[PDB]
Amino acid sequence: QNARAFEYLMTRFSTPEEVFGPLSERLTSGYLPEAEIVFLDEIWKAGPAILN
Amino acid sequence: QNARAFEYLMTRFSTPEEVFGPLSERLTSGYLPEAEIVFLDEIWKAGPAILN
């Protein structure tokens, strides 16, 4: 009844401020921490900050 | 009869606030969400936030 989708493509130069939301305290409105179903395309190529 | 054009060149340091419109809730007057035909030159060099 209450589910929010999230589509994102992990790149080699992607930053954590774009997947979960940028900080100001972190503007995470509609991203990953508040999403029922998340989709991450191509996970075998992200940076070390996203894997941590 | 009612079509708005949009010419933009994607750069390596481009920000989403210049393509879709800067926020104040987002001043998207004449950008991409309200445009019939959009043009993006050199798409193989944009940032990860605008590509997603």
DSSP B7-43: EEE--TT--HHHHT--B--B--TTSSTT-SS-EEE--
Taking an 8 Å cut-off on Cβ atoms, the answer to whether B49 and A18 are in contact is: yes
**Which of B37, B41, B3, B34 is closest to B20 using CA atoms?**
B34
Residue A15: how many CA atoms within 13 Å on its side-chain side?
A: 9
| Resolution rounded to one decimal, in angstroms | 6.0
Determine the residue type at B47: G
Structure solved via: cryo-EM
Whether residue A11 and residue B48 make contact (CB cut-off 8 A), yes or no, is yes
Question: Residue B10's Cα: distance from chain center in Å?
Answer: 9
How far apart (Å, rounded) are the C-alpha atoms in residues A38 and A4? 8
Closest CA to A17 of B44, B8, B41, B52: B52
Which of chain B's residues have a Cβ under 8 Å away from the Cβ of A9?
A: 51-52
Contact B52 A9 (CB under 8 A): yes
Which residue stretches of chain A are H helix? 16-19, 48-51
